[PDB]
Amino acid sequence: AGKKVLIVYAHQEPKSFNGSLKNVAVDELSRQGCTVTVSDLYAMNFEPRATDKDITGTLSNPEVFNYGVETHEAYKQRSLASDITDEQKKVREADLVIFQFPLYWFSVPAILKGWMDRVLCQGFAFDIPFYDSGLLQGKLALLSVTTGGTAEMYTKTGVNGDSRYFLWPLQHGTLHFCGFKVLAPQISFAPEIASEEERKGMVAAWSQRLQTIWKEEPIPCTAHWHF
Amino acid sequence: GKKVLIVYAHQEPKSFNGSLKNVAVDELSRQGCTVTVSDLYAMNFEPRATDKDITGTLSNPEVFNYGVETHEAYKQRSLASDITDEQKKVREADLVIFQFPLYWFSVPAILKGWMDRVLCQGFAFDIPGFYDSGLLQGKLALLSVTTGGTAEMYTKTGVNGDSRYFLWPLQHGTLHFCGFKVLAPQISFAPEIASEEERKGMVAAWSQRLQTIWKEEPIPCTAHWHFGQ
Ligand SMILES: Cc1cc2nc3c(=O)[nH]c(=O)nc-3n(C[C@H](O)[C@H](O)[C@H](O)COP(=O)(O)OP(=O)(O)OC[C@H]3O[C@@H](n4cnc5c(N)ncnc54)[C@H](O)[C@@H]3O)c2cc1C
Ligand SMILES: Cc1cc2nc3c(=O)[nH]c(=O)nc-3n(C[C@H](O)[C@H](O)[C@H](O)COP(=O)(O)OP(=O)(O)OC[C@H]3O[C@@H](n4cnc5c(N)ncnc54)[C@H](O)[C@@H]3O)c2cc1C
Ligand SMILES: NC(=O)c1cc(N2CC2)c([N+](=O)[O-])cc1[N+](=O)[O-]
Ligand SMILES: NC(=O)c1cc(N2CC2)c([N+](=O)[O-])cc1[N+](=O)[O-]
Ligand SMILES: [Zn+2]
Ligand SMILES: [Zn+2]
């Protein structure tokens, strides 16, 4: 009872296939009785750049600027920019964080990379001394990604290599590092090339999966699993 | 008459990344290379991929698709001038160096947005016309990366796994995809942790390698190189 879900959504176009996957997730989780929140990064015009503007008032060291150190101190002293702290409050509350994005250069769009860079700061998401000691432990995360390339292109012997290869920085380097349990990713291959029956199939496979995500076991987020 | 582009992503000129950038400029300049630096934070480079990147009529205003609309805008010469400025720098370069701190096992978002917006279809690749037939064929690229984690942490049985694991999306998914020959990356491990002499050692090791980069062969940018299966 009482689950909270955050969808971090990174697509420019509401009528896009990513938009449809986002809306189906909202409708399905909402129908289940979940509390749902969406961060529509493009709609918020989310700032992706990691700068000194992220710290309100005086800097820890004005002579030489170190983003990691200065955000860590600002977090502790409650003087991070309000857009960062609004996102952190959403993450703190969520039991599950879904990231919904098109694959850009085997990775996340820059706007979503900037959300990770700015929101997941030391003191909040991890400290030194991460992974299993990571501060977001107990939370689930699940990447829902769309690609331009077909499934066949993303195999061990295909041009792009296994899709698990590009997931490692996101799943292990980021999500696991912060203490998340990672659910198996949802990959919708090459929707722009797909038939309208296929696109419907992939959208329904997504909603079908959402009906039972609370029963899913996390993946073993290991080198072995990805490689 | 070699031309070099450094795409540089650090907020602070006094940083370790700034030092590596400066010795690259100094050393390449001393050899007689033509050198350009794109200092992204200093340019306040726009990382977001939006419809502002296209001037003039969208091909399909009703449903906006960034890849389609930028491809068409490239061909029509209606991309925003900050994108076209960077493309002219890439077009002219024999060697592109990326210099950046590792952020979440990847590039900082500002540099990610440079890749997302500069390397568009028609310019960097076509469908078909990618990997070994990518449009930037004949050009060299080199990642010069700094990390918070030490070398021990970035081994096969280290906490982070091998450093080559995180290089795949950049080296293969992006640089090789666009037709670049990729040189072996320069990784400067954990400079904030290092001693004064070890930081100097790492700077001098970069300088020293640059003296001879024109003699280097590219790596085999393969799954086996990155992953050893
Ligand atoms: C900078 C950049 C870098 C990229 N790098 C990579 C990369 O490294 N690797 C890779 O594989 N790809 C890459 N791509 C391709 C990219 O991942 C795809 O273009 C994207 O995933 C397609 O998803 P979409 O939401 O944008 O689809 P859309 O084009 O918006 O939708 C596909 C079709 O589905 C339709 N649709 C919408 N909703 C529904 C619904 N309810 N039911 C049925 N149909 C519907 C739409 O009308 C549309 O025709 C890159 C693209 C860009 C722009
Ligand atoms: C959002 C974020 C995400 C991150 N994710 C990762 C990650 O996934 N993995 C990881 O390993 N790390 C990660 N880090 C750490 C990051 O990679 C390091 O902080 C960065 O690489 C350190 O490089 P720097 O240039 O900033 O060093 P600096 O902060 O500048 O410090 C290095 C020292 O070298 C000194 N120095 C400068 N020039 C010279 C010179 N000429 N000779 C001798 N000494 C000199 C400086 O004064 C300084 O004391 C992350 C950091 C942030 C903020
Ligand atoms: N269709 C594809 O296979 C494709 C398409 C694009 N662009 C056209 C959308 C990109 N990409 O931009 O990196 C990459 C791939 N890819 O398989 O690595
Ligand atoms: N020093 C490290 O070990 C380190 C430090 C940082 N931050 C403090 C600079 C990050 N990181 O930001 O995810 C990651 C790692 N890491 O090895 O995966
Ligand atoms: Zn892991
Ligand atoms: Zn390759």
From Swiss-Prot, chain B:
Pfam (any one): Flavodoxin_2
Alphabetized, the UniProt keywords read: Cytoplasm, FAD, Flavoprotein, Metal-binding, Oxidoreductase, Phosphoprotein, Zinc
Q: Which cofactor does it need?
A: Zn(2+); FAD
Which annotated residues bind substrate?
Answer: F125, D126, I127
Reaction(s) this enzyme catalyzes, per UniProt = 1-(beta-D-ribofuranosyl)-1,4-dihydronicotinamide + a quinone + H(+) = beta-nicotinamide D-riboside + a quinol
Positions of post-translational Phosphoserine modification: S78, S195
Major subcellular site = cytoplasm
Q: How is the cofactor bound?
A: Binds 1 zinc ion per subunit.
| Residues annotated to bind FAD | 10, 16-19, 102-105, 146-149, 154, 192, 199
Question: Miscellaneous notes for this chain?
Answer: Uses dihydronicotinamide riboside (NRH) rather than NAD(P)H as an electron donor.
What is the annotated quaternary arrangement, including any partners? Homodimer.
Family listed:
Belongs to the NAD(P)H dehydrogenase (quinone) family.
UniProt name for this protein = Ribosyldihydronicotinamide dehydrogenase [quinone]
Organism, by scientific name, is Homo sapiens (Human)
At the highest ranks, the source species' classification is: Eukaryota, Metazoa, Chordata, Craniata, Vertebrata
Query: Gene that codes for this?
Result: NQO2
